[PDB]
Amino acid sequence: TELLKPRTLADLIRILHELFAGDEVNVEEVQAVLEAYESNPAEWALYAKFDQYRYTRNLVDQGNGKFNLMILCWGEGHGSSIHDHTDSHCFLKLLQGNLKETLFDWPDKKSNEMIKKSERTLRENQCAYINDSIGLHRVENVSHTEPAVSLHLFSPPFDTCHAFDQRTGHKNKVTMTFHSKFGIRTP
Ligand SMILES: [Cl-]
Ligand SMILES: [Fe+2]
Ligand code: NA
Ligand code: NA
Ligand code: NA
Ligand code: NA
Ligand code: NA
Ligand code: NA
Ligand code: NA
Ligand code: NA
Ligand code: NA
Ligand code: NA
Numbered sequence: 001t002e003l004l005k006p007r008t009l010a011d012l013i014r015i016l017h018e019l020f021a022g023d024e025v026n027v028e029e030v031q032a033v034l035e036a037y038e039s040n041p042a043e044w045a046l047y048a049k050f051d052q053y054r055y056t057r058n059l060v061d062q063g064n065g066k067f068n069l070m071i072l073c074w075g076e077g078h079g080s081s082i083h084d085h086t087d088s089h090c091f092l093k094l095l096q097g098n099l100k101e102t103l104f105d106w107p108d109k110k111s112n113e114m115i116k117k118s119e120r121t122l123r124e125n126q127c128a129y130i131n132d133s134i135g136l137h138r139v140e141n142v143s144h145t146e147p148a149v150s151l152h153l154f155s156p157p158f159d160t161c162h163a164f165d166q167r168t169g170h171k172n173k174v175t176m177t178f179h180s181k182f183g184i185r186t187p
Helices: 009-019 029-038 041-047
Strands: 056-062 068-074 089-095 097-103 116-122 129-130 136-140 148-155 160-164 169-174
Touching: 009 029, 009 041, 009 056, 009 097, 009 169, 029 089, 041 056, 041 068, 041 089, 089 097
Parallel strands: none
Antiparallel strands: 056 068, 068 148, 089 129, 089 148, 097 116, 097 136, 160 169
């Protein structure tokens, strides 16, 4: 329960394996530790694999079954769907650039446009947190000039979630695909 500042990405990962050694999750502590790591591009260049047309998901660590740690790479103008997180914890730390996070409420059964609840700009080294009881969100690199890179921790791991149609609130199931694993391209 003694949180030290992660010196490196590797150190961070080791501290995370400690924090998730058990069955439950201290959210505020995981968030603090993630925010405390100072992004060092050299340490994660291996995982920062971009695609021209959409954002990529790059597996960094499998957290001995308790979590998935991954790096997402967002080209200029790349963004996600409005999505949930499959009853898991979601931590999002910026390693490079900025991302816009837009919050949505869970839709009612009636077909209505999903109106934004709020939005915020996540900046380098900032760490955000979301879960399904908080709501839904969309994440976007709105920059025309700067690629964005983020570090995501999901616990428990999941490889499916829902995307929501902003016009209706209708949801469809989506399967998450890894662009790379441990620095190896996995087409
Ligand atoms: Cl996310
Ligand atoms: Fe998300
Ligand atoms: Na490292
Ligand atoms: Na650091
Ligand atoms: Na995209
Ligand atoms: Na990309
Ligand atoms: Na991907
Ligand atoms: Na950016
Ligand atoms: Na957004
Ligand atoms: Na959610
Ligand atoms: Na479903
Ligand atoms: Na990878």
